[PDB]
Design a protein around this nucleic acid. Structure first.
Lengths: 150, 100, 84, 50, 129, 155, 194
RNA sequence: GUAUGUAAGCGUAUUACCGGCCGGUACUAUUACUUU
């Protein structure tokens, strides 16, 4: 495991058995359907949208109170933007490569790390190219790394 | 300047309204319908001077964007340069009360 | 016994210290608690490893301690290990 | 011409395709209380006297 | 990566009785695998096997009586017609006496002598003795 | 596609404008005897009321489809009235009883009634007479043609 | 004088008398002064009264768009009906619209192109949760008997253990009468810290 | 008494029709694989 790495390490969540509890939660799936209309309209990513509901209210799992995945909860009220979220963190992480290595070169350890997220785009973006979540003839270009994220 | 102040603009592009140029900024500066004005450090010096004298009368607040016009012009989804900008309507973003 | 006959029915307490993941079923050690900050009165439910700064709508006393593990509040907390 | 074939969906004919539900659930939330008027009119007539 | 979910499940059974593990903790509850453990019980090779199901995959507990020698697997599923099943006996079994290779044809999963009476050609998954 | 652009004139041979004297009035709604293959394949509706000429068309030319019938996938379509399709199969070795991914490539001709076939669409194929040095097949039906992921969807 | 069906049995079926006799019992369950804001439209479709040799077990066909509100009333649905229909245990059981592909030479699917909530798992999963309704299932284990037969282990730690444990013998009957899987029900007292 | 390796009924396109359970006819997502 751990593709770009030597480690065998493993870190994740741990979902419980049942799919309805919290049943003691007086909160429904409907006010959180407004909360994504309230909070997710402020530009937040689908991961961190799902982290503010856990700590604050706190609903343990929105998959138990509502059936749809949260991008569909973005979409069914119209909050799915043009760009998928996780590469949008990578390309921002990719654009910080062309901010550190534009002037401070010789960092061939850092210049190793460009080859990761370019590959970690191009293997990853090939998957989303197929799934019709962004069209083909979408080619990542080097000058586009600034404006895709900004 | 910071990366975090750039994210405050990052929700204006989905929500808020815009004025790009001296002329589009100074037009709403005359009516005072703008709130926040942006100045990048490579602004020409009298242009770096002239905008903020309005702010002493229009009672608005400006910022010294520590980047360049090439990045600020691309920090807003465009590709052409940005030397000045006034966001006349903060749609959803949090520059309504935040200082740097 | 290393050559044991029962794996379906293990002893409970060693499973409680086994792992969050490697058990016979999947359930974490984490839970939810209902913290009342001692300078205030308001009821607030929060995760164990919350990984997030929480305050009330008007009662921002302590309510959390920022860490990588569980929120270890010393003498500034009152909650329970209970689904609410 | 191919772009606008089945395009009674976009602006108004989203809800004028969702009007199948807008004429049902909006009225019939009250008509069941109007269907149960035998124990609604006679219900509050008992609590007003007793 | 878990390449073939069949074969990895088989070998840990063989990696039990050598140090004498009478029990097997086993993963991950596929219905092609549930069609296979009872064939051992159909000739009484192992003990009692049970399956808890988590809502990811499920996992299997297997008790063992200790009568096995080795269960095996040909990989991948070679296509075998009727007239050439006998080639896969002598290369895989100690003799014609005991032991059982197990293929699966379009009618289901069975013994080879079962298949030698059912007469339908199919694909090898594994073997045991 | 065509406004009869040719340095000669193109017309389906075997029909004539016969105007007044006729056994009855056999208008037939167009003077174009569109045949059919009748091998279970439905005729395309655009072939009957077509303006295209296409002497090598299997529906409307001097062609009767023969041979066998197969399916497959298509790659290139630049050349005129002609697409480049691809078929897949396996091979059985002796040393291993194992298989391989080899393939052949047969160039084929299209009537314009299957206009706008692209990569990588799915097209069935049937045989006919030799056309010009390679082409002994003809396209039968745009059967599926659906890539639900990358090719067959708008954007 | 004695009103029965046509208030609750649509949109299901008018047979039968045993489904009709509880409908005269349903209208006197409307007089509980607390459920009358709800059961005026909570409809039924069918019913069944299958016995375990001596006592009967009553099957209630909820149509399930109202299972979100059928659940919180279900504490009071079973209790007042049991003292009126003693000693016949009652439980709501939603029979589903099972979409098969028939066991033929790959027989044709269309129509009803089979969403994944409409397969043979619903014979277990969509059925087992409604039989042991308030149990809060924690674990299902598949015991495999010798001659290709099966036992399933259904786990409930303490979640209202002290009110439905006298029905787990009845629960063993109707699950084998509806699905066929031989079942046992698991007690254990240990609050297994997770 | 027992066994289960047998077919039908029964948790369901166990297809539509005319015939004496029984002939004819309406009439089916594919491959690879294997069957004759």
């Amino acid at each position: 495991g751990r593709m770009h790495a030597p480690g065998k390490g493993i870190s994740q969540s741990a979902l419980p058995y049942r799919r309805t509890v919290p049943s003691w939660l007086k909160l429904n799936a409907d006010d959180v359907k407004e909360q994504i209309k309230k909070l997710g309209k402020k530009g937040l990513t689908p991961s961190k949208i799902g982290i503010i509901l856990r700590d604050s209210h706190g609903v343990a799992q929105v998959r138990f109170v509502n059936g749809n995945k949260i991008l569909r909860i973005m979409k069914s009220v119209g909050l799915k933007p043009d760009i998928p979220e996780d590469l949008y963190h990578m390309i921002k992480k990719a654009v910080a490569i062309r901010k550190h290595l534009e002037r401070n070169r010789k960092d061939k350890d850092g210049k190793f790390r460009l080859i990761l997220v370019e590959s970690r785009i191009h293997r990853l973006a090939r998957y989303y190219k197929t799934k019709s979540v962004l069209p083909p003839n979408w080619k990542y270009e080097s000058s586009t790394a600034s404006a895709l994220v900004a | 300047a910071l990366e975090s102040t750039n994210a405050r603009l990052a929700l204006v592009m989905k929500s808020g309204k815009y004025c790009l140029g001296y002329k589009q900024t100074l037009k709403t500066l005359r009516q005072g319908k703008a709130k926040l004005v942006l100045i990048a450090s490579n602004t020409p010096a009298l242009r770096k001077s002239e905008i903020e004298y309005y702010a002493m009368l229009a009672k608005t607040e400006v910022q010294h964007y520590s980047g360049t016009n090439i990045e600020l012009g691309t920090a807003c989804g465009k590709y052409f340069r940005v030397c000045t900008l006034s966001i006349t309507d903060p749609g959803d973003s949090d520059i309504i009360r935040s200082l740097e | 016994m290393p050559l044991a006959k029962d794996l379906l029915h293990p002893l409970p307490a060693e499973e409680k210290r086994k792992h969050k993941l490697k058990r016979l079923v999947q359930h974490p050690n984490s839970y939810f608690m209902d913290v009342k900050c001692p300078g205030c009165y308001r009821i607030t439910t929060v995760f164990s490893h919350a990984q997030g700064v929480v305050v009330c709508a008007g009662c921002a006393t302590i309510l959390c301690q920022p860490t990588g593990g569980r929120a270890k509040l010393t003498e500034g907390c009152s909650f329970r290990r209970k689904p609410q | 011409m191919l772009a606008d074939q089945a395009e009674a969906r976009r602006q108004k004919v989203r809800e004028a395709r969702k009007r199948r539900e807008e004429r049902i659930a909006t009225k019939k939330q009250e008509l069941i209380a109007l269907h149960a008027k035998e124990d609604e009119i006679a219900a509050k007539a008992a609590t007003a006297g007793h | 990566v878990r390449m073939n979910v069949l074969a990895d499940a088989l070998k840990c059974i063989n990696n039990a009785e050598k140090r004498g593990k009478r029990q097997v903790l086993l993963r991950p509850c596929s219905k092609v695998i549930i069609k296979f453990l009872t064939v051992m019980m159909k000739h009484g090779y192992i003990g009692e096997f049970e399956i808890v199901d988590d809502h990811r995959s499920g996992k299997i507990v297997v008790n063992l009586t200790g009568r096995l020698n080795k269960c095996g697997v040909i990989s991948p599923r070679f296509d075998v017609p009727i007239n050439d099943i006998e080639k896969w006996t002598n290369n895989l079994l100690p003799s014609r006496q005991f032991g059982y290779v197990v293929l699966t044809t379009s009618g289901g999963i069975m013994d080879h002598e079962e298949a030698r009476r059912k007469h339908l050609g199919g694909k090898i998954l594994g073997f045991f003795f | 596609m065509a406004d009869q652009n040719e340095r000669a004139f193109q017309k389906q041979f075997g029909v004539n404008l016969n105007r007044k004297v006729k056994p009855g009035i056999t208008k037939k709604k167009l003077l174009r005897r569109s045949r059919d293959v009748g091998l279970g394949f439905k005729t395309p509706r655009e072939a009957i009321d077509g303006t295209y000429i296409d002497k090598k068309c299997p529906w409307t030319g001097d062609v009767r489809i023969r041979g066998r019938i197969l399916t497959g996938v298509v790659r290139k379509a630049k050349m005129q009235r002609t697409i480049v399709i691809r078929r897949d199969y396996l091979h059985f070795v002796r040393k291993y009883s194992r298989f391989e991914k080899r393939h052949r490539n047969m160039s084929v001709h299209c009537s314009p009634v299957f206009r706008d076939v692209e990569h990588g669409d799915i097209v069935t194929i049937g045989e006919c007479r030799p056309l010009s040095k390679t082409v002994r097949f003809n396209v039968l039906k745009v059967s599926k043609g659906q890539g639900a992921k990358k090719s067959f969807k708008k954007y | 004088m004695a009103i029965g069906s046509k208030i609750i049995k649509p949109g299901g079926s008018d047979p039968d008398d045993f489904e009709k006799s509880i409908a005269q019992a349903l209208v006197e369950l409307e007089a509980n002064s607390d459920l009358k804001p709800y059961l005026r439209d909570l409809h039924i479709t069918r019913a069944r009264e299958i016995e375990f040799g001596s006592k009967k077990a009553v099957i209630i066909y909820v149509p399930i768009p109202q299972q979100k509100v059928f659940q919180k009333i279900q504490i009071i649905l079973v209790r007042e009906l049991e003292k009126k229909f003693s000693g016949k245990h009652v439980v709501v059981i939603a029979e589903r619209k099972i979409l098969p592909k028939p066991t033929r030479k790959a027989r044709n699917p269309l129509k009803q192109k089979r969403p994944r909530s409409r397969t043979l798992t619903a014979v277990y999963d969509a059925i087992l949760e409604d039989l042991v309704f308030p149990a809060e299932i924690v674990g299902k284990r598949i015991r495999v008997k010798l001659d290709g037969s099966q036992l399933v282990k259904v786990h409930l730690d303490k979640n209202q253990q002290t009110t439905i444990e006298h029905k787990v013998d009845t629960f063993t009957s109707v699950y084998k009468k509806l699905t066929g899987r031989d079942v046992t029900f698991e007690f254990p007292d240990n609050y297994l810290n997770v």
